[PDB]
Design a protein around this nucleic acid. Structure first.
Length: 1025
DNA sequence: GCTATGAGTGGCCCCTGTGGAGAGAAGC
DNA sequence: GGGGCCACTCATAGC
RNA sequence: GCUUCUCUCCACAGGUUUUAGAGCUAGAAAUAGCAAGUUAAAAUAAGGCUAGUCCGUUAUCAACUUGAAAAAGUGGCACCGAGUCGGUGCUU
């Protein structure tokens, strides 16, 4: 006998609950075989559980990092281009100049040339630094001086401008000498070009030098005043780099705001600080040069400075004059945002179409890359696809053919009643054409009264006509056709079907592009038929929006019997007069066959396809995929007999179409059999419910839940969802409530942490200073971390068990050892390629290959007394046990917590308050149970004693505060990484388990996605010492 | 009797701000 | 939020 | 007309690290005084081959067997009880 049953589901941003129930709402118990080398061969479990897993993340951070990588690469490319331009002349002056520029980051031992980068000698370096304290002094010197400058200095200035080429927020050429646009220039320039009264073509350098000199004078004044009045604080302000003073502001990491905050009280205590205080009010005291406000500098300023320098120095260097346009273009060139990455097809991101196979350079971007086709593809990819034709593309909403289709479809169902007619009749094809020509091409809006007084009365001589199916005006109209009559002014050109392709392409061009240059370039192909004035009028017209049907669907496919398209049928269909719906649903035509051929039944959907295509955050996508896998595994468990009903709830991410999509996916996977009439047999009913009903069900029958106790709440909520759904669809309070009460107190609830392989960054991005520790990771292959600092805190992807011998001590004695070795994400490919060699590099000897077992994150180990640990990393564990608090205590805690916030009748509230008053002794029992659980599985003796002392010291607190603090106390016992928490006025530190040696002799457990199947491996038996 | 270790406790640490442009879906 | 690192400090195994 | 899922591209400013910008005086040193302090180069996830002015942090992943992978297969029931689950009867 196939035992009928039902399955309930709960979907969350972090957890999914699974539960199997029968008509009796009981949870059946079955016994499962255990695989491995343990004596425990079979375990009985309850068919209930919930999966916990990390929140899914979006690609937004990945997208940002990819953009940054490309930007860095292109900046390097621009530097390389400038280097190639200057290389031939540089070889004539200094061969190793670029070599020094490259390896300057290495120590003096690792340099292959002289240590001074710019000149290769100390005297000239001192001269350079003295004559030009900052780069802006050099820039101003090059802008103004007419003397033949040193080539290397010119290269340095050009590189500095290129690598900091500014922003492109304003198009066109800007006037640095600067109604509203001029006002915008004046406002923006003065914010950067502050009071630049000297007549110069490079005001930015003058402003920066003024700021530097003001900084110098202000610092001198502050030093003098402090040394005269407050000698004791001189060392603290000007030598203590750990504070927020000047030493911290320059040598340390202190920023501008912190420095001002620290210095403001000091200025208040001295005399003569009014000017300094005023400058503090304007954020002008001791300001740096390389500051964040520079982000508003337009690129045009740097372009002007570059142009001036090139003009000044070109007379001494002929090669500059020939390449002046090239140098200017390098700065001005940016890849247009609609082109995309310049890839050779080997990337899933790019969409460029290439004309010639030459290497793309900034000087030949125009000649090699089709900007028009590039923009077409850019708009075209990931644009909405036709539903009827998945491969094709929908036409623009303002397409002429779309307007014709809408007009003919609207007129398709129009009936007219005249004198002598007993029944209304459809309009014939000739009638449709005449009506369209007379009104739809002559009136921007066509109404019922207009038709009556213009076609029936005038043309067909019908005095009285009744029109049905149209509400006082026709929704479809030839507005685009009227615009084309306005601009082109050639009726026959528009009415010729030979021009349909050109007109449709023109409409598409006007719909796609907003840059009028692109429109002009693409319509330049059609300028041979239209004069310049008509071309000018069209270029001003713009359209937006997309339709719901494609060209190939309407006027592309033909009936194999008649050869007519859908447009052809709508123009004239005789007595049938089928509309679009009838044409696509008529069996006598091949259009339905064409549509069915268009539908693609590929691999199992909602495995990857819908998971990556449904609308929502990736987290809910992950949750739905896990739910589907859980349902499949449950079906596998139940003997592959599909459940009668499925109840699902989607928790709000702290009428939704995503719920309907999940329902459809579940129906598709479960109901797969068609009947004799090609109709799917729904042996599985899919149920959607509201959380409000289940919440009220909980509130009505004292079946409260607390999210802070343990994770059984998801499973219980799913169980209640299923029970309520089944009860409502089928529609014994004596038996069902008792069954629910028994189920809710069940301790054996399979909770499994989803084992995962950690991915992401290799390590923390904060580069730490050098220090004598081998745990420091280099930024490059050949850069010793002790000598150059680098990355720290790598993230381990997983650890692999090692059974081998290690040389220990100075004697290098081989000692047989057993230990856990973690593998970092940066090392994953190297290890998985050949574990033996990688382990040999680590120093392990006599590797036992067959014993290597993959142990990902959250791998579960079993210890004595039922104590469990989850492998958080190669050197840290997490708690693996849940507090099974009896239901009556949970209800008491809920009532005490909401004691002053009860939402119910006064009598019910009074009864609950009296019940709370009666059972105040529950506090001691809860505390004792917490203590026993902690002693048995937590091992937090010091923190446990502190907690016990705290509870005794405040046994007399009000019940509500007692309950609130006791609820917070569960943080020590919750599953996962231990977390600190406050209990009344005392802070409790987090007990962290930094010892992983004990799990070597433990019981390793592998659990399925639901954990019903268990595979237990005893690591102690392997490689006994 | 000496040293490596390793086991435990407590506390600090983690890259940030902005701009431009381009289809839908779900809801106000 | 949670894991990696450092700095003391003492217990204990190995020489 | 406004919010979000986008999710992709083009962009800027920073920030971090090492090196360079000769510290001086008295003192053997510890140290004491003095002076200066604003900038520059390179990298900005190890690197990989398809060698691109491309790609590298989204998504996917219990164990055993077959498969490059995808993919597929691999695990009795019933009853009675319930502190992380136990006992009883048939069968292979």
């Amino acid at each position: 006998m196939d035992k009928k049953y039902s399955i309930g589901l709960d979907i969350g941003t972090n957890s999914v609950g699974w539960a199997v129930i029968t008509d009796e709402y009981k949870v059946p118990s079955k016994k499962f075989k255990v695989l491995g080398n343990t004596d425990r061969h079979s375990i009985k479990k309850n068919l209930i559980g919930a999966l916990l897993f990390d929140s899914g993340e979006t690609a937004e951070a990945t997208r940002l990092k990819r953009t940054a990588r490309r930007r860095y690469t292109r900046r390097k490319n621009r530097i390389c281009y400038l280097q190639e331009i200057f290389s031939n002349e540089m070889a004539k002056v200094d061969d190793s100049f670029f070599h020094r520029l490259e390896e300057s980051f290495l120590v003096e031992e690792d340099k292959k040339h002289e240590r001074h980068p710019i000149f290769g000698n100390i005297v000239d370096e001192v001269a350079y630094h003295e004559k030009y304290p900052t780069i802006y002094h050099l820039r101003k010197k090059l802008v103004d001086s007419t003397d033949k400058a040193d080539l290397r200095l010119i290269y340095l200035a050009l590189a500095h401008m290129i690598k900091f080429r500014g922003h492109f927020l304003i198009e066109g050429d800007l006037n640095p000498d600067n109604a509203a646009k001029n006002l915008s220039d004046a406002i923006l320039l003065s914010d950067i070009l502050r009071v630049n009264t000297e007549i110069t073509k490079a005001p930015l350098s003058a402003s920066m030098i003024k700021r530097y000199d003001e900084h110098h004078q202000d610092l001198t004044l502050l030093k003098a005043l402090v040394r005269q009045q407050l000698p004791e604080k001189y060392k603290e302000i000007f030598f203590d780099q750990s504070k927020n003073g000047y030493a911290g502001y320059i040598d340390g990491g202190a920023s501008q705001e912190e420095f001002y905050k620290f210095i403001k009280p000091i200025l208040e205590k001295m005399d003569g600080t009014e000017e300094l205080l005023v400058k503090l009010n304007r954020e002008d005291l001791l300001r740096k040069q390389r500051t964040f406000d520079n982000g508003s500098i337009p690129h045009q300023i740097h372009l002007g400075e570059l142009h001036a320098i090139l003009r000044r120095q070109e007379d001494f260097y002929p090669f500059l004059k020939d390449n002046r346009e090239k140098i200017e273009k390098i700065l001005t060139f940016r890849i247009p945002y609609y082109v995309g990455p310049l890839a050779r097809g080997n990337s899933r991101f790019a969409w460029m179409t290439r004309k010639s196979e030459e290497t793309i350079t900034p000087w030949n971007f125009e000649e090699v890359v089709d900007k028009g086709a590039s923009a077409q593809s850019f708009i075209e990819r990931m644009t909405n696809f036709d539903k009827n034709l998945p491969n094709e593309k929908v036409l623009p909403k303002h397409s002429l053919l779309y307007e014709y289709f809408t007009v003919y479809n609207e007129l398709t169902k129009v009936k007219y009643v005249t004198e002598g007619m007993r029944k209304p009749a459809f309009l014939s094809g000739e009638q449709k054409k005449a009506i369209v020509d007379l009104l739809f091409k002559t009136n921007r809006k066509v109404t019922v009264k207009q038709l009556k007084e213009d076609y029936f009365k005038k043309i067909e001589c019908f005095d009285s006509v009744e029109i049905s199916g149209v509400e006082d005006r026709f929704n479809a109209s030839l507005g685009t056709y009227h615009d084309l009559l306005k601009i082109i002014k050639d009726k026959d050109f528009l009415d010729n079907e030979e021009n349909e392709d050109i007109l449709e392409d023109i409409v598409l061009t006007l719909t796609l592009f907003e840059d009028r240059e692109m429109i002009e370039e693409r319509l330049k192909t059609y300028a041979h038929l239209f004069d310049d004035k008509v071309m000018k009028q069209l270029k001003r017209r713009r359209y937006t929006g997309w339709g719901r049907l494609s060209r190939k669907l309407i006027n592309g496919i033909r009936d194999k019997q008649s050869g007519k398209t859908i447009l052809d049928f709508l123009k004239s269909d005789g007595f049938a007069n089928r509309n679009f719906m009838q044409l696509i649903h008529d069996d006598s035509l091949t259009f339905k066959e064409d549509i069915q051929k268009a539908q693609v039944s590929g691999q199992g959907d909602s495995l990857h396809e819908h998971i990556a295509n449904l609308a929502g955050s990736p987290a809910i996508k992950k949750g739905i995929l896990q739910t589907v896998k859980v349902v499949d595994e449950l079906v596998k468990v139940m003997g592959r007999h599909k459940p009668e009903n499925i109840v699902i709830e989607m928790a709000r991410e702290n009428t939704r179409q995503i719920t309907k999509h999940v329902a459809q996916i579940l129906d598709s996977r479960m109901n797969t059999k068609y009947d004799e009439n090609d109709k799917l047999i729904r042996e599985v009913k899919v149920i959607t419910l509201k959380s409000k009903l289940v919440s009220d069900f909980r509130k009505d029958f004292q079946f409260y839940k607390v999210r802070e106790i343990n994770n059984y709440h998801h499973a219980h909520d799913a169980y209640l969802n299923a029970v309520v759904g089944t009860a409502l669809i089928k529609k014994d309070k004596g038996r069902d409530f008792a069954t629910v009460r028994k189920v809710l107190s069940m301790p054996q609830v399979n909770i499994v942490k989803k084992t995962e392989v950690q991915t992401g960054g290799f390590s923390k991005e904060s580069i730490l200073p050098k220090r004598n520790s081998d745990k420091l990771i280099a930024r490059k292959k050949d850069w010793d971390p002790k000598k150059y600092g680098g990355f720290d805190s790598p993230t381990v992807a997983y650890s692999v068990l090692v059974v081998a011998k290690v040389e220990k001590g100075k004697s290098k004695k081989l000692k047989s050892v057993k230990e856990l070795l973690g593998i970092t994400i940066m090392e994953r490919s190297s290890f998985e390629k050949n574990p033996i060699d990688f382990l040999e590099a680590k120093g392990y000897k006599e590797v036992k290959k067959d014993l290597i077992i993959k142990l990902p994150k959250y791998s579960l180990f079993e210890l004595e007394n039922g104590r469990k640990r989850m492998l958080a990393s190669a050197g840290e564990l997490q708690k693996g046990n849940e507090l099974a608090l009896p239901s009556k205590y949970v209800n008491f805690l809920y009532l005490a917590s909401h004691y002053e916030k009860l939402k119910g009748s006064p009598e019910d509230n009074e009864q609950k308050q009296l019940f709370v008053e009666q059972h105040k002794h529950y506090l001691d029992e809860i505390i004792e149970q917490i203590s026993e659980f902690s002693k048995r599985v937590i091992l937090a003796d010091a923190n446990l004693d502190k907690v016990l002392s705290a509870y005794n010291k405040h046994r007399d607190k009000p019940i509500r505060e007692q309950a609130e603090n006791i609820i917070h106390l569960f943080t020590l016992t919750n599953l996962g990484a231990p977390a600190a928490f406050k209990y009344f006025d005392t802070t409790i530190d987090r007990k962290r388990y930094t010892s992983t040696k004990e799990v070597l002799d433990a019981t390793l457990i592998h659990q399925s996605i639901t954990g019903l199947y268990e595979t237990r491996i005893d690591l102690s038996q392997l490689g006994g010492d």
